[PDB]
Amino acid sequence: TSQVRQNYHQDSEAAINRQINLELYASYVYLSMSYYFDRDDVALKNFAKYFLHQSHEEREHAEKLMKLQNQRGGRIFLQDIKKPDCDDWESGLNAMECALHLEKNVNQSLLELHKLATDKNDPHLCDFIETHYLNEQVKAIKELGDHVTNLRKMGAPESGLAEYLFDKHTLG
Amino acid sequence: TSQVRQNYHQDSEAAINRQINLELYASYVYLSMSYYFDRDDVALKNFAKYFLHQSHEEREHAEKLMKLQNQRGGRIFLQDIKKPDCDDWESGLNAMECALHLEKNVNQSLLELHKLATDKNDPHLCDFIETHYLNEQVKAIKELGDHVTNLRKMGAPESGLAEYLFDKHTLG
Amino acid sequence: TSQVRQNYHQDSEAAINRQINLELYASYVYLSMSYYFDRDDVALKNFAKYFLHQSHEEREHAEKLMKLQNQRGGRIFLQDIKKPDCDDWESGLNAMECALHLEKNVNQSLLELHKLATDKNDPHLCDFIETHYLNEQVKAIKELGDHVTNLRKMGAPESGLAEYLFDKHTLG
Amino acid sequence: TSQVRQNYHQDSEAAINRQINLELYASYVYLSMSYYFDRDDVALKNFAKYFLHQSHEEREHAEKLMKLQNQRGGRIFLQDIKKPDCDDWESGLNAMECALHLEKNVNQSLLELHKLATDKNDPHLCDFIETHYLNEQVKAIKELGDHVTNLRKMGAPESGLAEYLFDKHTLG
Ligand SMILES: [Cl-]
Ligand SMILES: [Cl-]
Ligand SMILES: [Cl-]
Ligand SMILES: [Cl-]
Ligand SMILES: [Cl-]
Ligand SMILES: [Cl-]
Ligand SMILES: [Cl-]
Ligand SMILES: [Cl-]
Ligand SMILES: [Cl-]
Ligand SMILES: [Cl-]
Ligand SMILES: [Cl-]
Ligand SMILES: [Cl-]
Ligand SMILES: [Cl-]
Ligand SMILES: [Cl-]
Ligand SMILES: [Cl-]
Ligand SMILES: [Cl-]
Ligand SMILES: [Cl-]
Ligand SMILES: [Cl-]
Ligand SMILES: [Cl-]
Ligand SMILES: [Cl-]
Ligand SMILES: [Cl-]
Ligand SMILES: [Cl-]
Ligand SMILES: [Cl-]
Ligand SMILES: [Cl-]
Ligand SMILES: [Cl-]
Ligand SMILES: [Cl-]
Ligand SMILES: [Cl-]
Ligand SMILES: [Cl-]
Ligand SMILES: [Cl-]
Ligand SMILES: [Cl-]
Ligand SMILES: [Cl-]
Ligand SMILES: [Cl-]
Ligand SMILES: [Cl-]
Ligand SMILES: [Cl-]
Ligand SMILES: [Cl-]
Ligand SMILES: [Cl-]
Ligand SMILES: [Cl-]
Ligand SMILES: [Cl-]
Ligand SMILES: [Cl-]
Ligand SMILES: [Cl-]
Ligand SMILES: [Cl-]
Ligand SMILES: [Cl-]
Ligand SMILES: [Cl-]
Ligand SMILES: [Cl-]
Ligand SMILES: [Cl-]
Ligand SMILES: [Cl-]
Ligand SMILES: [Cl-]
Ligand SMILES: [Cl-]
Ligand SMILES: [Cl-]
Ligand SMILES: [Fe+3]
Ligand SMILES: [Fe+3]
Ligand SMILES: [Fe+3]
Ligand SMILES: [Fe+3]
Ligand SMILES: [Fe+3]
Ligand SMILES: [Fe+3]
Ligand SMILES: [Fe+3]
Ligand SMILES: [Fe+3]
Ligand SMILES: [Fe+3]
Ligand SMILES: [Fe+3]
Ligand SMILES: [Fe+3]
Ligand SMILES: [Fe+3]
Ligand SMILES: [Fe+3]
Ligand SMILES: [Fe+3]
Ligand SMILES: [Fe+3]
Ligand SMILES: [Fe+3]
Ligand SMILES: [Fe+3]
Ligand SMILES: [Fe+3]
Ligand SMILES: [Mg+2]
Ligand SMILES: [Mg+2]
Ligand SMILES: [Mg+2]
Ligand SMILES: [Mg+2]
Ligand SMILES: [Mg+2]
Ligand SMILES: [Mg+2]
Ligand SMILES: [Mg+2]
Ligand SMILES: [Mg+2]
Ligand SMILES: [Mg+2]
Ligand SMILES: [Mg+2]
Ligand SMILES: [Mg+2]
Ligand SMILES: [Mg+2]
């Protein structure tokens, strides 16, 4: 047993390792999306910038969980980072919809993690999740919802003009 | 009788209390409108900001009337603030139209108040209304009219693109 | 269903709407108290300033709950804001006592809201209440208790000198 | 007839001369009050300072009316400035009460002047009175009322301690 370990259940340790993988996966999805918009036949530079920033944020989320694992005396175990589900993301609207779906999936995982921490009476872990993850997720989901709504109302994906103008005035 | 009271008719005192309630009501209408535009399925952040600012201005209008009541030796009597007539405001154009209607209604009340002050030969109260309320109302009505016109000419409410672009270039 | 909604119970949504109304009510109580102290026959300007600031803080509390409702994909439903229970607040001490009672009532509502969020396993909502409301309430209640104690010990409400000196040295 | 005179009734001209005298009288009352508080057997230096400032303000009120008379092509006619009604002002509270009475008397004269200007359809003179005199009077009366209230509640005039503390914390 680690000399620092206290009130840290083996199930919580394993769930933290699973969350690390999921955050890295989310980073990869956003990386793929970003460079799709950098294609010469797509060419929406602020969509590209927005998703690259989201990708880098997800990496920060993963690294903080790795730090947490060590803080509590757990041991990090890494797994393959699966490639994203799509190579071609179709449109700005479709990418935003996939991002919304991704963020809700990551949120569900975080909520399950919190439920586990609650069941194991781990208030430090509960606080960690609430303070650093849960509101960030709520804000990210709300922002993506707002973006999807605007793109739909503007006439995307059929209107290339709508995506162009959204790229300039919301993401730029 | 208040030691400060002079040339201040009981009817004027009562009319000032009614105006306080109406200004607070206007604040509530704009508060409701503001957060409608903050909904994830509406998502027009500058409409939200514009109406929240209008809401806060209406509260200032109410507070100045409360100050006036005490300055003249009248006594403030408060009533319930009625909820706004709508929960859902439909569109940017529809909210602007409701705001225009509201501002004209508040103006009519102020004009009736001025007529009362005139009938009771209260030049201090006349000056108060003219100096702090009447031109503010005229400017607010003109601005809302301008906004309604632009939204109509741009193709609102059917064009979600029109409302988006107005939000960015006029309200942003 | 809102595209952003996740782990947000209909009961929690309704309870948030009730809390919005209560925060606005508290804003109204403090607004009334403030202008009582602005009366020429009361004339305690720092009591007036203190309660006006408390009123504006309560409005901020309401607006943050409206933001929360939209963040989680709930829908804001507003009700009439009831007038405060008193027109005349009697004395500085009596107003402080009514403020203490009000703040404890609002606290009780927040605790019931937290219990509901706990029962529905909504850790985001629990964190929201704890982080933004519960300690603010504890601090406000403690401050009002301190004020009541000092006014009593100084000889209020019978001593107009006590209220005058408290207004100058604590609230000024 | 003066080359500048237009829409300026002889009655208005005469009433302006009477108001000039009354403003100078008010200046004299406050001058007398001020130095009463400078007596070694009274010795309230902030009462003295407050009333001296009020005296100088009244002189400014008179001078602006003299300017107005010439602006409109009327001719200034001056009369004796009567001595104040009291040599000894008794107490801080009594002086404040006399100041309140004085300010209401001057207000009544200004209201009669405004009624005359209205009867003679002189909107320039109406505006002059409203803009430069009427709210100043309302504010002065309210302030004096507030002061009287505080002194009474503190225990003046019997409490020399009350007048001392008021001098330090309100007027200082
Ligand atoms: Cl342990
Ligand atoms: Cl352990
Ligand atoms: Cl274990
Ligand atoms: Cl593991
Ligand atoms: Cl894994
Ligand atoms: Cl693997
Ligand atoms: Cl696999
Ligand atoms: Cl726990
Ligand atoms: Cl967070
Ligand atoms: Cl947000
Ligand atoms: Cl937030
Ligand atoms: Cl957006
Ligand atoms: Cl009168
Ligand atoms: Cl009256
Ligand atoms: Cl009357
Ligand atoms: Cl009334
Ligand atoms: Cl009313
Ligand atoms: Cl009512
Ligand atoms: Cl009713
Ligand atoms: Cl009049
Ligand atoms: Cl105005
Ligand atoms: Cl204008
Ligand atoms: Cl203008
Ligand atoms: Cl416009
Ligand atoms: Cl759910
Ligand atoms: Cl849900
Ligand atoms: Cl539900
Ligand atoms: Cl509800
Ligand atoms: Cl309610
Ligand atoms: Cl209702
Ligand atoms: Cl009811
Ligand atoms: Cl929970
Ligand atoms: Cl808090
Ligand atoms: Cl505290
Ligand atoms: Cl604290
Ligand atoms: Cl205290
Ligand atoms: Cl003291
Ligand atoms: Cl003429
Ligand atoms: Cl003439
Ligand atoms: Cl004439
Ligand atoms: Cl004359
Ligand atoms: Cl004369
Ligand atoms: Cl003479
Ligand atoms: Cl004589
Ligand atoms: Cl006229
Ligand atoms: Cl004025
Ligand atoms: Cl004032
Ligand atoms: Cl004023
Ligand atoms: Cl005072
Ligand atoms: Fe982000
Ligand atoms: Fe960032
Ligand atoms: Fe993440
Ligand atoms: Fe994320
Ligand atoms: Fe907790
Ligand atoms: Fe926390
Ligand atoms: Fe405005
Ligand atoms: Fe403004
Ligand atoms: Fe208004
Ligand atoms: Fe308005
Ligand atoms: Fe506070
Ligand atoms: Fe504050
Ligand atoms: Fe509150
Ligand atoms: Fe509170
Ligand atoms: Fe003055
Ligand atoms: Fe001055
Ligand atoms: Fe004067
Ligand atoms: Fe004066
Ligand atoms: Mg996984
Ligand atoms: Mg594979
Ligand atoms: Mg937080
Ligand atoms: Mg009404
Ligand atoms: Mg109703
Ligand atoms: Mg003006
Ligand atoms: Mg309620
Ligand atoms: Mg009722
Ligand atoms: Mg905290
Ligand atoms: Mg005279
Ligand atoms: Mg004589
Ligand atoms: Mg003015």
Curated annotation (Swiss-Prot), chains A, B, C, D:
Residues 6-155 form the Ferritin-like diiron domain. It is found in: Cytoplasm; Lysosome; Cytoplasmic vesicle, Autophagosome. Belongs to the ferritin family. CDD domains: Euk_Ferritin. Expressed in the liver. The record marks 18 as: Essential for association with cargo receptor NCOA4. Fe cation 2 binds at residues 58, 103, 137. It comes from the Eukaryota. One of its GO terms (cellular component) is autophagosome. This is Ferritin heavy chain. Oligomer of 24 subunits. There are two types of subunits: L (light) chain and H (heavy) chain. The major chain can be light or heavy, depending on the species and tissue type. In the human liver, the heavy chain is predominant. The functional molecule forms a roughly spherical shell with a diameter of 12 nm and contains a central cavity into which the insoluble mineral iron core is deposited. Interacts with NCOA4; NCOA4 promotes targeting of the iron-binding ferritin complex to autolysosomes following starvation or iron depletion. Keywords: Acetylation, Cytoplasm, Cytoplasmic vesicle, Iron, Iron storage, Lysosome, Metal-binding, Neurodegeneration, Oxidoreductase, Phosphoprotein. Its main location: cytoplasm. It comes from Homo sapiens. InterPro entries: Ferritin (IPR001519), Ferritin-like (IPR012347), Ferritin-like_diiron (IPR009040), Ferritin-like_SF (IPR009078), Ferritin_CS (IPR014034), Ferritin_DPS_dom (IPR008331). It catalyses: 4 Fe(2+) + O2 + 4 H(+) = 4 Fe(3+) + 2 H2O. Fe cation 1 binds at residues 23, 58, 61. Its EC number is 1.16.3.1. Coiled coil: none annotated. GO terms for molecular function: ferric iron binding; ferrous iron binding; ferroxidase activity; identical protein binding; iron ion binding; iron ion sequestering activity. Stores iron in a soluble, non-toxic, readily available form. Important for iron homeostasis. Has ferroxidase activity. Iron is taken up in the ferrous form and deposited as ferric hydroxides after oxidation. Also plays a role in delivery of iron to cells. Mediates iron uptake in capsule cells of the developing kidney. Delivery to lysosomes is mediated by the cargo receptor NCOA4 for autophagic degradation and release of iron. Pfam families: Ferritin. It is linked to Hemochromatosis 5: A disorder of iron metabolism characterized by iron overload. Excess iron is deposited in a variety of organs leading to their failure, and resulting in serious illnesses including cirrhosis, hepatomas, diabetes, cardiomyopathy, arthritis, and hypogonadotropic hypogonadism. Severe effects of the disease usually do not appear until after decades of progressive iron loading.
